[PDB]
Nucleic acid binder design. Sequence first.
RNA 1: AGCGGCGAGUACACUGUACUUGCUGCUUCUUAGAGGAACAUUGUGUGUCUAACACAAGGAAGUUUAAGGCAACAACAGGUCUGUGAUGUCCUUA
RNA 2: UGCAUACUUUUCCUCCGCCGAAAGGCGUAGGUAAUCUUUAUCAAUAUAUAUCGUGAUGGGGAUAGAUUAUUGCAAUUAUUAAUCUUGAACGAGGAAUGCCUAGUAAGCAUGAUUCAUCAGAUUGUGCUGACUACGUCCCUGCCCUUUGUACACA
Lengths: 154, 41, 128, 138, 157, 98, 96, 48, 180, 58
Amino acid sequence: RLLEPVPFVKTNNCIKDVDADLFIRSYATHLKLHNKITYPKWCTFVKTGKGRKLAPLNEDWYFIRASSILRRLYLHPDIGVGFLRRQFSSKQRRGVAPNHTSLASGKILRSILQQLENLGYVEQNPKKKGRRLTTKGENAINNFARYINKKVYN
Amino acid sequence: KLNHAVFIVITPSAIAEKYKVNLSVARAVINHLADSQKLYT
Amino acid sequence: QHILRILNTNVDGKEKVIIALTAIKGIGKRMATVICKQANVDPTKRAGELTTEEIDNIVHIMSTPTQFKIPDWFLNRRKDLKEGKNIHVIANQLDSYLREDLERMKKIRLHRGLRHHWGLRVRGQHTK
Amino acid sequence: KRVQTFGKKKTAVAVATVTNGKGLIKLNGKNLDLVEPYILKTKVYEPLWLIGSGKLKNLDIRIRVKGGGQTSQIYAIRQAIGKGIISYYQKYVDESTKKELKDVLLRYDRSLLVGDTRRCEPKKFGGKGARARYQKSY
Amino acid sequence: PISKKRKFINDGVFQAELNEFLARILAEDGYSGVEVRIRELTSLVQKRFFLCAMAQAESLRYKLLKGLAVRRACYGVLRHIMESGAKGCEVIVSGKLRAQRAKSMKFRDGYLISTGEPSKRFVNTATRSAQLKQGVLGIKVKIMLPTSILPDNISVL
Amino acid sequence: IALTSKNLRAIEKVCSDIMKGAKEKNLNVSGPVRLPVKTLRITTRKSPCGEGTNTWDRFELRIYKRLIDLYSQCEVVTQMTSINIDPVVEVEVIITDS
Amino acid sequence: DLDKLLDLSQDELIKLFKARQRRKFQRGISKKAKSLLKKIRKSKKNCEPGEKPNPVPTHLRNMTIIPEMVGSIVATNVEIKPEMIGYYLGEFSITY
Amino acid sequence: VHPKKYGQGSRQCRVCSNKHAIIRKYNINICRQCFRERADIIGFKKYR
Amino acid sequence: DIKLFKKWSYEEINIADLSLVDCIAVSQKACVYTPHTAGRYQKKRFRKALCPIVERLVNSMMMHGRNNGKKLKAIRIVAYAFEIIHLMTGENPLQVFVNAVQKGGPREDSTRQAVDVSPLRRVNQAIYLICTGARNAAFRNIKSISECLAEEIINCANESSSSYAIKKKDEIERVAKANR
Amino acid sequence: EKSKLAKVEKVLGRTGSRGGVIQVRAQFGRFLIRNVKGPVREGDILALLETEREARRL
RNA sequence: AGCGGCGAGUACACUGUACUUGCUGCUUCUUAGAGGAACAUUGUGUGUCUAACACAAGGAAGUUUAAGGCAACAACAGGUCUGUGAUGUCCUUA
RNA sequence: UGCAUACUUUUCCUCCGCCGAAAGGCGUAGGUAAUCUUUAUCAAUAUAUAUCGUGAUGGGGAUAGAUUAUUGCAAUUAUUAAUCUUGAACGAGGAAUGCCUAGUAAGCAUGAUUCAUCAGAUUGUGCUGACUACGUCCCUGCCCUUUGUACACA
Ligand SMILES: [Mg+2]
Ligand SMILES: [Mg+2]
Ligand SMILES: [Mg+2]
Ligand SMILES: [Mg+2]
Ligand SMILES: [Zn+2]
């Protein structure tokens, strides 16, 4: 599907050398297999952000979100909740008044982050700013990426 | 009007044309055969 | 069952379950989805392949959702004016409730009620 | 050894650091495998295809992009690559080869070497856009 | 503590205020200045804080107040300007002026460039509103100074 | 040392003068770095009234901040600063080790 | 119930009411509101069970109705029932 | 006396005490017409 | 090797008009792999002649306000159409497109009396007509745009008055004839 | 219906009250002074149908 | 403001790549001052072979390169005294 | 609840950490600014993969009903915001008429101005990037020479 004749070699080492959506999906699947992260209470009847005016329709969207968050963390040095919210923003059609940008429902994100920290994937750094990845977690992510790459090659 | 049904050279439009069907059903059929725009033979 | 009846006056024909459900005057989309989730029934299935038991269950869920897990802030008609419970009102019942409210307003001679009676806005809009 | 040039489309400066290496070619921290949309991918790969994939096994490339939207960014990247490879050739490889490469690029199209000079013209009062005025009913 | 932008604007405002104050005070003076009997002025400023066009305009206003034949005064002013080495001048006086309705009166001598950044540079302009019998007379004086060279000329040796 | 001002050419001249002063002796002077000119734009609508096809006018008070470094003693730097100067260029000296 | 509501504390009442009213209560009530309340109380005290007491002309339309002020008339005149409660004063000024 | 601290009628033009059309950016607080006249002295030059 | 869409090479293509060749340049420097060129095709009178035909088609497709300035989408649609052409009604899609273009131009037009049409103008008209027809087919149908467009293209290639553009052209020709 | 190729030699004058049309001289290989509606240059080839019937010069 | 320089690592490649903490030659990108560059230059047409235009090459650019800003003379009985402590008269002043 | 006295962060941008479905809240952190908000990315169109499937339809969000907040002395004639629900007109628009020639039209957003609060406005800025001229006086409006005039308030 993705593969093609390219004019260079790809150092498939870290997650930045992997296609995103597929990777996310894979991570979600892995999570599901594990049963490493829950699905709180309110998750199953909440709306992800003001602009969505409708539920997710993905069943295991939470897992996907978590995966995305991990990737984001890997990408940036130190990333807050506000930043995360901003990242997962969309257009809110206000019916008749024109669209505005809409900040995501941060609570769910926060919960996810908390869960991750409990599990030992993210790390609230006392120096600098809000919650980056923890080294072990990063390593795990890298491994997963590598695995994905291998699969794709196969 | 044309109330298409659900209960009973591959593309969805073609399928719709032929057996008079919803295109979700066409998609399903395609998937079955295999087992956001489409092309199949 | 191409064509169905879940409550007082519906259609719920060939459409995919959630949208069929939304035909009722708890036509929430989101609300419908939530209901479906509560039920635990595949939303990719159509309205015609549903069992009667399932339908009954859904109906039950719709009637007083507060005692079910489905949360408080969600519920259509928040405090119910009649100083008591918070419950989703559903179907012709909703309409009746609305009518009652209107009547009450009229009785009060609050400006909004008066406006409603007249057939003018209420909102604060202009229409000049 | 190592050569730094830029591309430029609209605002969107892609700075291509072209170094001695094995032939990987990257964007900020990501392979050119990604870029973003599958459709536009060819606009980045095209100079490489023109020059030949074997010629770039001596040359590593990193590209830092900043500013602009998507298509513009892609264009900038392309431009950087075009300027970059040629610049490298002019210094550390021969002149004849460089000339050949330039000729090839010219035959394909402009924009690879020389830049797109267009930029968003200031909006003017009495309207929403540059030229587009409001509306008179009389 | 106040930011740079905020500071600059404030300074500008202060300058403007000072100028206005000077204008208010010195009806009897050839005023231009703005660089810091006068004791009182100094005190006032402290309390607050914690050839030329303007002068000519002022003179004109004074003359008007005194009560001259207007045209004659304007002519005199023009002559004075010429003497002071001006390449060109222009005075306007619009207002009531003798008749009730209207009546703007131009008084040019030498050539007066109007358009371009040269205009902005190489003319001093000034505007005073002399209050009089039954309203206001409206001075505007415009002087073209000696250039540091005009963009139009191409002086071959 | 930070030199904030409104008038470009004057500022430039001042900078040049200070450079010259430095070049005398004893001063490891980093070159003048002009900062991002944060332009105060006011878009006012011309015309007191509401008559005429509402023309605006974009004014721009464009402040030039200029910056320059040294490794020195206070008195010497003060002396250097004394080029006479005037009300137009706003000077500030920072005498910090850090 | 109405009587029960009347009996119970102000905090409870605030909690019961819709959120705007609650917020207002939290903020305070100003010097005039208290006076108005007092006046209402006085009127109630003066009342006859057959026919309603004398009105109380009021300039301001901001007041939320609370079980203190049921049974009397206020301001043109408006009678205040227990059915109204947290629905503001008003009902004053517009034609057609 | 009634709260005159936050509203259009709270503050005014520095110059002529007018409550309407005040340039309130950068704490200038001059009603725009007045500003237009004194834009030269404040150091606001029209370039573009 | 030089190619388009990494698939249809246009070394195999043919033309047989002369005038049309002169007008539309699918050449040595008007080689292209994906339509999206940021070319300066409207800074001169005849610089639109250098423009590749695929690009032109994409531009044409791009029309109608709520879909305006969505180049990528248009490109995708055209790719899909090409694929369809390749698969069903098996031929080099480029050739088909060329044929359609050849067909499409009304050779004589009316004015305030009958006059002839320049080749470039005719080509432009054809491009417009094909896209407009496709759009019409799409609008409030179901079918899908790419499929419809493909169908239209095939019809044009054939030279058959079931599609809209061809019909329009015919009408124009008739009008011209009537005039003179 | 049968189109005949006429290579343009010179573009004479831009006619029509509103300015859309051009007068053109075209060689097959005979001189036929004809009208054109759209951008035309020297060397470009017209699609003439009704060949032997000319226009009026300016 | 960056780029490197380089320590310190964490992952994986081959016999370098991705990512953070700690220390401090280059100015391509980042900022912004002074300079430069296009003049229809060279080429070829059309033109009283005048002023000039069209095309081609070069070129970052060939419609004064694109965009503004500035705005003559004279008005309009145009608007604004509801911007002003610019301002006349008449009114109003417990 | 009132005054008086003492003393110190807060009045604007919000990082971040917690509570909150949401809005927002509480705690604290930097910033009088190329340092912090935040900008090697603050946006939406984009694109990719799913659900729909031409059915006033999940297009459309008017009108309405009932809360939870925030701003403010004060929110009803609902400031705005959020949550649930209500599912109207509209299937591309008649006579007319506006804007536009290259980073332009259009689409998409967004900063700033007003601002205690509130953009559907204006004003800037960008992002996606068409069509068609490359001319003409046919209309419309200006300008010019000639011509006619009993008009000059033209
Ligand atoms: Mg001049
Ligand atoms: Mg407005
Ligand atoms: Mg018109
Ligand atoms: Mg007469
Ligand atoms: Zn004022």
